[PDB]
Design a protein around this nucleic acid. Structure first.
Lengths: 240, 83, 141, 53, 65, 167
RNA sequence: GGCGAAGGCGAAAACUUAGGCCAUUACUGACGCUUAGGCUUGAAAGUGUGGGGAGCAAAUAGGAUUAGAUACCCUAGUAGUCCACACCGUAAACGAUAGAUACUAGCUGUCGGGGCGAUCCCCUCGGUAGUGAAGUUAACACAUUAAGUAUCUCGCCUGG
């Protein structure tokens, strides 16, 4: 299949009493108790639209920057995506200053490359504090710039666990003219995505199946095998 | 208190005048009398006097309508606009 | 059907319509209800035909007891209304009228003014062509 | 205020309401206008409410 | 925390319900505020007027500490 | 319109003379009759109203009149044979309704559930069991009767859509 | 928290009664709307009129201190604060946001009313609040109670 409705089984409900009303236009008529439940058919339609749209964008020799910044679950599974499909991954969101100022990513990636070279070229003269400085510089420039740590190419598309979760992601997204697609919740402002994906992320199955479907969409545009919507089994893994 | 139901039903000639001009003007006149009695018994109740003047004004406008629409309002005028 | 949120006499049909139109423009709202009148029906039909406004439905309870009209604005699939500004002309405190030869094209020669005349209600262009003038109900562009 | 039969324990539970009533009387032992009195009293009340809510 | 209209009768005089009133009372001439017993406007009226009424009839210390 | 009238009479007067004082009080009472001298006992006053540490309490239950209790109140005040002359009216705040006063049966159920007479728990007033979704739920919306449907089509579901082809 | 037209309303108790909140195709059938003029009310000082005046402070007066205290300190301390009458009728009576009218994402609170039901939760509508969307003030921010939206009427407005 392709973006099967079988995955659309637990994409309902989040933290209540906090929700953007304009999501009720895009999700469903939500009760006074802030019922964060999502519809199935409209969510599936929008998810399939995003799927094949990012597929056709990545078939144009583009890039889908996979961003993972939630507690541990989204980040770990985005790293699994990166090790499954050749796409960039986020351990920690870049603090801003990547796209509109291209020099600021180039300096970081070059610094990390030279840091790796220095770590692999000399370790006898270094002291414990000097080695800690070197490792901390590596860690800093890897987390101060997650999507740009060894590559200089400008991403042609980026996702995020929540388009209101990351200010820098939105800034470097709206800097470019790209179809930004993101996992959107009820507490999220819908005005920061191209195709809204109204679905849950507090439920771990929901978000992991969603971003795995995104991984399959980018992989089928990269001519490599795809697993979800092609295997009927839904993943069961609690949100680490 | 309000002195509502008895005065209404006395002014309620039929089942077709529960909220007519007749019952309204009767209520305003009865309220003017009751408010005069109250405010003479209760001097510094400025709420009562301001309400009395408001009812006097609304009664004046109700009477001007009742003479604009029906010409028999002043042929049996027991509600002359003078107060 | 079920038409909700009735409105009573605010002070006039024209301002009652204008406040709803501007509130719909503000809150990105789709369909709003207002009073019903022959002039309102004429202007609403002509605005449906003009393209600035989407359709409307005139409703009654049984008679003059209650006559209202619900009306929707034409929206693309982006929550963008077709209404880019509507100004009421006929007002209670100011009864405004113009001859057939003194009616301008609004926007940049594109906007269409709605004009009632001695023998009917029509658009500004055909009002000039009709050689008959009268009151103006709404400048629409 | 009266807390009896204990030298320190009932006296310890005494002193709280004792000073409460003493301050309640103290803020009534000087002439002042309703303005500042009510403004400060309600400012403290809203401080306590926001600390509570 | 609401107290009246659940243990009270919605009609509070001094007799037959004086214990619910004395619950916001002490022999010290004080009434528990909303921070301890968050009763609504009518229940606060109940407790205030009725307790100072019992003080007024010489049932509980009017001001006495 | 009913008067719950509470009279606190002098000191520790004997029951007979206290009742006679009360009888004089009805004799100077112009309100509705039918009130009988009910002895509420000799209750200790919190303070001497004039000099009496404890006063004899009495209650009278009957109807009420409008311009007939001010005079009774001030005469009972002036009458030194009785110390205190409290009045209570029918209207304090409560209900005169067949669907808010019979809710006091729910209050009796609340009294029953106040103490856990069994191991199970139905205590803690304001504990939401959510047994009610009904009620009025009515703002009385206007029913629509069709007169004319000028192009009944109406636009709906404006999805976030732009530049659908980018491949 | 509610109400009162602002002025305001808190020891309690009663009465007269303005007015209020909830839902009524229910009734006259526009009877409507405001408001220059016009009517009434209007914190308060302080005025005199009769009492008591418990207390105190304008003024005044001593000791300080000061470059000096009738300023900050206090003691003595009147008008007055108290009440009855008028007049004073001004206020930070300013939300520096007019009255009547209808509409505009929500969200989290409260009070009152209607329904319901151990309580309750809940829904309805108002009142009473806010962050904030939209919208609107240069800006500060308001924002379903607007400074948002619009109709009728009035008042205020062009340099120090």
């Amino acid at each position: 299949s392709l973006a099967k409705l079988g995955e659309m089984r637990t994409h309902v409900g989040m933290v209540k009493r906090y929700w953007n009303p304009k999501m009720g236009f895009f999700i469903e008529p939500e009760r006074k108790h802030n019922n964060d439940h999502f519809v199935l058919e409209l969510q599936r339609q929008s998810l399939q639209t995003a799927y094949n749209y990012v597929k056709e964008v990545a078939q144009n020799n583009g890039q889908i920057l996979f961003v993972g910044t939630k507690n541990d679950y989204v980040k770990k599974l985005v790293n699994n995506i990166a090790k499954r499909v050749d796409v960039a991954f986020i351990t920690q969101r870049w603090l801003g200053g990547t796209l509109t100022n291209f020099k600021t990513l180039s300096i970081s990636i070059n610094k990390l490359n030279k840091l790796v070279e220095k770590q692999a070229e000399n370790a006898a003269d270094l002291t414990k504090k000097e080695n800690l400085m070197l490792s901390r510089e590596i860690e800093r420039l890897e987390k101060f710039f997650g999507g740009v740590k060894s590559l200089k190419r400008l991403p042609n598309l980026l996702i995020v666990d929540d388009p209101v979760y990351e200010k820098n992601a939105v800034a470097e997204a709206n800097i470019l003219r790209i179809p930004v697609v993101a996992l959107c919740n009820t507490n999220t402002n819908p005005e920061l995505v191209d195709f809204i994906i109204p679905a849950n992320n507090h439920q771990p199955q929901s978000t992991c199946l969603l971003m795995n479907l995104l991984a399959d969409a980018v992989a089928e545009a990269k001519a490599m095998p795809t697993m979800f919507a092609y295997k009927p089994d839904e993943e069961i893994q609690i949100e680490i | 208190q309000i002195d509502k139901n008895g005065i209404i039903k006395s002014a309620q000639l039929h089942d077709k005048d529960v909220g007519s001009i007749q019952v309204q003007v009767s209520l305003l006149t009865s309220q003017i009398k009751q408010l005069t009695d109250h405010l003479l018994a209760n001097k510094k109740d400025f709420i009562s006097k301001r309400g009395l003047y408001a009812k006097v004004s609304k009664r004046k406008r109700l009477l001007k309508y009742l003479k604009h629409n029906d010409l028999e309002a002043y042929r049996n005028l027991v509600k002359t606009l003078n107060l | 059907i079920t038409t909700t949120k009735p409105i009573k006499a605010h002070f006039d049909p024209v301002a009652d319509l204008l406040t709803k139109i501007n509130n719909a423009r503000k809150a990105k709202l789709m369909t709003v209800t207002t009073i019903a009148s022959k002039l309102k029906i004429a202007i609403l039909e002509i605005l449906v035909k003009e393209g600035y406004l989407a359709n409307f439905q005139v409703l009654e309870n049984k008679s003059k007891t209650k006559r209202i009209v619900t009306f929707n604005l034409k929206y693309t699939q982006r929550r963008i209304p077709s209404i880019n500004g509507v100004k009421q002309i006929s007002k209670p405190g100011l009864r405004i009228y113009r001859p057939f030869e003194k009616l301008p094209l609004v926007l940049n020669g594109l906007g269409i003014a709605i004009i009632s005349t001695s023998d009917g209600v029509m658009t500004d262009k055909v009002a000039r062509l009709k050689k008959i003038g009268g009151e103006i109900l709404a400048y629409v562009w | 205020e009266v807390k009896n039969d204990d030298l320190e324990l009932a006296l310890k539970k005494f002193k709280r309401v004792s000073l409460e009533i003493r301050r309640l009387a103290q803020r009534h032992e000087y002439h002042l206008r309703k303005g500042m009195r009510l403004r400060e009293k309600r400012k403290i009340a809203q401080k306590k409410r926001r600390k509570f809510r | 925390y609401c107290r009246f209209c659940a243990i009270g009768q919605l009609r509070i005089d001094l007799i037959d319900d004086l214990e619910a009133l004395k619950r916001f009372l002490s022999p010290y001439a004080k009434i528990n505020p909303r921070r301890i017993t968050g009763n609504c406007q009518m229940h606060q009226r109940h407790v205030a007027k009725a307790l100072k009424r019992a003080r007024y009839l010489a049932l509980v210390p009017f001001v006495k500490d | 319109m009913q008067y719950n009238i509470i009279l606190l009479v002098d000191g520790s007067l004997s029951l007979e003379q206290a009742n006679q004082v009360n009888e004089k009080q009805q004799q100077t009472l112009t309100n509705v009759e039918g009130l009988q001298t009910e002895y509420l006992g000799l209750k200790e006053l919190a303070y001497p109203i004039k000099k009496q540490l404890s006063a004899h309490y009495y209650r009278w239950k009957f109807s009420g009149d409008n311009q007939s209790t001010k005079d009774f109140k001030r005469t009972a005040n002036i009458n030194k044979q009785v110390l205190r002359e409290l009045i209570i009216n029918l209207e304090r705040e409560y209900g005169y309704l067949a669907s808010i006063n019979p809710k006091k049966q729910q209050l009796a159920l609340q009294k029953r559930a106040k103490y856990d007479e069994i191991i199970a728990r139905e205590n803690n007033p304001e504990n939401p069991d959510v047994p009610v979704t009904s009620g009025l739920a009515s703002t009385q919306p206007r029913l629509s009767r069709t007169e004319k449907a000028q192009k009944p089509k109406e636009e709906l579901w404006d999805v976030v859509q732009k530049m659908g082809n980018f491949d």
